[PDB]
Amino acid sequence: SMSYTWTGALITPCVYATTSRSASLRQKKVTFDRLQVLDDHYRDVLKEMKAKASTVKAKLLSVEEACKLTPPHSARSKFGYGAKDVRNLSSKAVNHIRSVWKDLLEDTETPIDTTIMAKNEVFCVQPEKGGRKPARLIVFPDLGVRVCEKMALYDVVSTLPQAVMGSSYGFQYSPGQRVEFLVNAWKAKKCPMGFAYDTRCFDSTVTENDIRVEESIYQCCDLAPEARQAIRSLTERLYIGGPLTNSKGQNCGYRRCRASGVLTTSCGNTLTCYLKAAAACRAAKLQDCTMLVCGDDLVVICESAGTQEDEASLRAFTEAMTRYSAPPGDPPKPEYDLELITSCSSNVSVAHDASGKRVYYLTRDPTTPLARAAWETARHTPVNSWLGNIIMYAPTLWARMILMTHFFSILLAQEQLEKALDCQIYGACYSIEPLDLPQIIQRLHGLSAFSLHSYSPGEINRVASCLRKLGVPPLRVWRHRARSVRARLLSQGGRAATCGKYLFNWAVRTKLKLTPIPAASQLDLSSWFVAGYSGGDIYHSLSRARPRWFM
Ligand SMILES: O=C(O)/C=C/c1ccc(NC(=O)C2(NC(=O)c3ccc4c(C5CCCCC5)c5n(c4c3)CC(=O)Nc3ccccc3-5)CCCC2)cc1
Ligand SMILES: NC(=O)COc1ccc2c(c1)S(=O)(=O)N=C(c1c(O)c3cc(F)ccc3n(CCC3CC3)c1=O)N2
């Protein structure tokens, strides 16, 4: 079947930013008939996944619990209420949500409407390879439906992926735990070989059968009968496909592939990619495979069979993925150093802590983080990518010297150190106070994140070259700026002083011997790094448990 069919009605509007103007170019790329051929490897892997899914017991979320996960600025309903009404449990919001639920239980077939829009994302104007990337397409149902999806499937999509894929499920790891997993897998092999597999437009490649196979896995859970019916109806009426409406309310077309903005997108894509890849590893005869899967992002570490043999096994893996309707974007290439593999737009690098001991950490090319940060300093944005980058990339040279210095100087100038900001981590929205960053960083990366040094030449050069290319002052300027930022933070005391002392410890000549922040243990990070919710419309406000008077 065709991934999409179009009426011709335009996908209407809401360093460069992707707009609604480039939507036509994206539509051409993602529109095609899918040819899927399944085999015994696929069937064997599915049965193994199902046996693991069978250990899961999932609970039905109440209307109140589902309402509480809704982001404050989530798209309003076309039925007379918005995200504020949902979070307040308003009479109108709650009555409509209950009617949507009742309809899911009563109607098992009518396709549910969705809205289609072009994603506005900032990329760097780099005239080195081709040109500007076309806008990605976002497909999502109405607010009432999104609350119902949480009631039925929030517990499933939060628990089932780890139960099925075990250590291969990537969203259970913080960046440091992801690094630890990759390093351990690499060291376990006699002669390691690793590769990333890029699927061309993964959402478009997902077939009706893929979605039903994904539902057959959900159905292995112990579920409340209404949750079981809701999952069955949501599968047929929403997940499998349905009509597309643009922002103007015009019939835009029809979808028969994965919608980006439903609660099951991340879980479903991860399960689908894992199933196809594990089956393709068997068809390719790759020895002792370790897979790490995050949605459509796949990395495989295995036992090398020699240079020519590895190139041949990779082409066999690709042919098998292609049959399963997961063809490649960039062709996969075997890598023989862990540091050279790019997965989840990141690579492993090594540094030393204050005692000269090796510390592996996760980094990336800083061009896109710096460009996006520049866009965000220039104009007000709902989500602050700089904040998420400081959190996830806290041990890196560039996040510490440039992002921390620049944004802390802006917060000091605006007196907004205590103002909570939104950032996206694994598709979920978190409301975080920048004053909590030293405690968050210690919890996720450890005390060593504040004293790393002896960065690799390759890492230092990538950073320095990127600054030159973007017209950013050199690293020596950032050291001078950080010394002043640090001094002003120290003067303020409390959490602000901890920001100065811990985040800017690298900027001082003498360098302090840092002790653990006592209040860090109080942070409730239980919802962090459990699952991916990309396009799932999930929100959390960072909270503190058992606070001590003197902290
Ligand atoms: O050789 C030496 O010894 C010293 C050299 C030297 C060179 C340049 C400066 N620049 C500055 O003082 C100014 N800009 C900056 O001090 C500046 C700060 C951050 C900048 C950023 C990002 C960095 C990441 C956080 C957000 C801001 C970008 N650009 C920046 C410029 C350059 C810029 O203009 N825009 C972009 C565009 C895309 C990406 C990055 C940038 C402020 C007043 C005059 C211009 C200072 C010293
Ligand atoms: N195709 C589908 O359906 C979704 O497929 C997906 C594939 C990968 C991801 C997602 C969806 S996500 O939207 O859930 N977010 C991330 C992600 C982040 O949130 C993230 C946030 C930051 F501020 C900084 C770095 C981040 N990094 C890199 C560092 C990390 C440790 C690995 C991610 O990868 N990964």
Q: Which residues contact 430 (CB under 8 A, 6 or more apart)?
A: 422, 423, 424, 528, 539, 540, 541, 542
- Tell me which of 296, 330, 345 is where a domain ends: 345
Tokens, residue 211: 């979605």
Closest CA to 157 of 71, 41, 270, 308: 270
Q: Which ligand is nearest to the CA of 472?
A: 1
Distance 412 CA to ligand 2 centre (A): 30
How many other C-beta atoms lie within 10 A of the C-beta of residue 514?
16
Rounded CA gap, 300 and 166, in Å?
15
Same domain (yes/no): 335, 366: no
- With residue 65 as reference, give the H or E element that holds it: helix 63-68
Q: Is any atom of ligand 2 closer than 6 Å to the C-beta of 267?
A: no
The alpha carbons of the chain give a radius of gyration, in whole angstroms, of: 24
- Fill in the amino acid letter for 203: D
Same domain (yes/no): 331, 358: no
Q: Is any atom of ligand 2 closer than 6 Å to the C-beta of 347?
A: no
Closest CA to 207 of 301, 103, 123, 326: 326
Q: Which ligand is nearest to the CA of 206?
A: 2
Distance 534 CA to ligand 2 centre (A): 8
Q: Is any atom of ligand 2 closer than 6 Å to the C-beta of 532?
A: yes
Tell me the β-bridge partners of 360.
Answer: 350
Distance 19 CA to ligand 1 centre (A): 26
Residue to mutate, 389, 426, 430, ligand 2, most ligand atoms under 8 Å from C-beta: 426
Residue to mutate, 344, 364, 533, ligand 2, most ligand atoms under 8 Å from C-beta: 344
Same domain (yes/no): 313, 376: no
Long-range contacts formed by 506-512: CB under 8 A, 24+ apart: 506/400, 506/401, 506/450, 506/451, 506/452, 506/453, 506/482, 507/479, 507/482, 507/483, 508/483, 511/354, 511/451
| Domain of residue 383, residue span | 346-551
Burial class (CB in 10 A: 0-12, 13-18, 19+), 297: buried
- Scan for tokens 């009555």, then name that residue: 95
Atom number, ligand 2, closest to the C-alpha of residue 173:
31
Distance 371 CA to ligand 2 centre (A): 18
**Cβ–Cβ under 8 Å, residues 155 and 534:** no
- Label residues 338-359 b or e (16+ Cβ within 10 Å = b): beebebbebbbbbbebbeeeeb
Tokens, residue 70: 């809704």
Tokens, residue 282: 């068997």
- Tell me which of 345, 362, 379 is where a domain ends: 345
Same domain (yes/no): 282, 143: yes
List strands edge to edge, sheet with 251-255. Answer: 4-6, 251-255, 242-245, 114-118, 137-140
297 in a known ligand binding site: yes
**Cβ–Cβ under 8 Å, residues 292 and 195:** no
Q: Is any atom of ligand 1 closer than 6 Å to the C-beta of 475?
A: no
Distance 135 CA to ligand 1 centre (A): 28
Rounded CA gap, 345 and 360, in Å?
17
Burial class (CB in 10 A: 0-12, 13-18, 19+), 207: buried
Please tell me the residue having the least CA distance from ligand 1 atom 26: 374
Tokens, residue 368: 């896109």
Closest CA to 178 of 301, 260, 356, 46: 301
198 in a known ligand binding site: yes
Rounded CA gap, 529 and 197, in Å?
23
Q: Is any atom of ligand 2 closer than 6 Å to the C-beta of 198?
A: no
**Cβ–Cβ under 8 Å, residues 17 and 122:** yes
Same domain (yes/no): 295, 404: no
How many other C-beta atoms lie within 10 A of the C-beta of residue 282?
18
Residue 95 C-alpha from the chain's centroid: 33
Q: Is any atom of ligand 2 closer than 6 Å to the C-beta of 388?
A: yes
Give the Å distances, CA to CA, from 100 to 103, 197, 231, 530, 537.
5, 39, 13, 28, 17
Same domain (yes/no): 387, 289: no
Q: Is any atom of ligand 1 closer than 6 Å to the C-beta of 470?
A: yes
Residue to mutate, 467, 472, 477, ligand 1, most ligand atoms under 8 Å from C-beta: 472
Same domain (yes/no): 99, 155: yes
Q: Which ligand is nearest to the CA of 264?
A: 2
Same domain (yes/no): 324, 357: no
Same domain (yes/no): 383, 253: no
Same domain (yes/no): 392, 246: no
Angle, CA of 410, 16 and 469, to the nearest 5°: 70
User: What does the longest C-alpha to C-alpha distance in the chain come to?
Assistant: 70
Q: At what angle do helices 307-323 and 265-283 cross, to 10 degrees?
A: 130
Supply the DSSP symbol for 108: S
Same domain (yes/no): 339, 358: no
Helix (H, G, I), strand (E, B), or coil: what is residue 324? coil
Angle, CA of 211, 212 and 217, to the nearest 5°: 95
296 in a known ligand binding site: yes
How many other C-beta atoms lie within 10 A of the C-beta of residue 125?
9
Please tell me the residue having the least CA distance from ligand 1 atom 12: 473
Same domain (yes/no): 243, 369: no
Helix (H, G, I), strand (E, B), or coil: what is residue 1? coil
How many other C-beta atoms lie within 10 A of the C-beta of residue 91?
10
Rounded CA gap, 432 and 444, in Å?
15
How many domains are there within the chain?
A: 2
- Tell me which of 345, 361, 386 is where a domain ends: 345
Residue 439 C-alpha from the chain's centroid: 22
Distance 488 CA to ligand 1 centre (A): 21
Rounded CA gap, 147 and 104, in Å?
12
**Cβ–Cβ under 8 Å, residues 125 and 375:** no
